[PDB]
């Protein structure tokens, strides 16, 4: 499976956007969390289907598939959020009809911090002019790199996606040194995504304990991350 075919396969596997609408009135702490969690819940279902379309993912052991998904889900959700927001500075496009202003992050205690590192990272991806194909590779890499016989099969799958990303950057036409530098600049941002995910999951868990918003079923299983 050549790099182009892998990239092409990821492009097709892109899940359609989940449509959710902003509540009628100005957000309240409860209505914002209900919105964010309802969207996350529905996107998680599609994320599972997306993952199965990633070459070799279904060939890993069920337990590994689970561990990988329990470990990266929020990062994947956020990587998708930043991409949708790439062409809208100061804005977070959670959904077509759910465009949040940084200032709206004031109604939920502690989420404003989250919105900021997301906006900051987005600005960075904007600075670098992240491309669609690049984005596809990176999101897949996040899933396969969340390693937080298949283990060997996993490494091979990550190198396949890495090769694809390398291939995409090469097609841009920049010098060989600049390709290396771009590959580096793009990947140095994964640490930021991982950190944002951590704050996000700590935050959501807190909102749940606070009874600020209900969290149950699939969203919950992912949150607890212990179905195994």
């Amino acid at each position: 499976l050549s790099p182009e075919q892998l990239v092409l396969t990821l492009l097709e596997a892109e899940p359609p956007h989940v449509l959710i609408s902003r509540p009628s009135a100005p957000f309240t702490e409860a209505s914002m969390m209900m919105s964010l969690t309802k969207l996350a819940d529905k996107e998680l279902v599609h994320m599972i289907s997306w993952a199965k379309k990633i070459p070799g993912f279904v060939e890993l052991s069920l337990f590994d598939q689970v561990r990988l998904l329990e470990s990266c889900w929020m990062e994947v959700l956020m990587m998708g959020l930043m991409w949708r927001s790439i062409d809208h500075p100061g804005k977070l496009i959670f959904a077509p009809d759910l465009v949040l202003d940084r200032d709206e992050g004031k109604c939920v205690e502690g989420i404003l911090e989250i919105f900021d590192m997301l906006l900051a990272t987005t600005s960075r991806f904007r600075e670098l002019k992240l491309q669609h194909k690049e984005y596809l590779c990176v999101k897949a890499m996040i899933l396969l790199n969340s390693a937080m016989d298949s283990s060997r099969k996993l490494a091979h799958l990550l190198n396949a996606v890495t090769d694809a990303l390398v291939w995409v950057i090469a097609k841009s036409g920049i010098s060989s040194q600049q390709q290396s530098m771009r590959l580096a600049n793009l990947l140095m941002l994964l640490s930021h995504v991982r950190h944002a995910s951590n704050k996000g999951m700590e935050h959501l868990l807190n909102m749940k304990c606070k009874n600020v918003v209900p969290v149950y079923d699939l969203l919950l299983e992912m949150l607890n991350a212990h179905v195994l």
Partner: peptide
């Protein structure tokens, strides 16, 4: 708990 909904979506659908 430990088999149901993540696991269901992964192997059932």
């Amino acid at each position: 708990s430990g088999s149901h909904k993540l696991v269901q979506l992964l192997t059932t659908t």
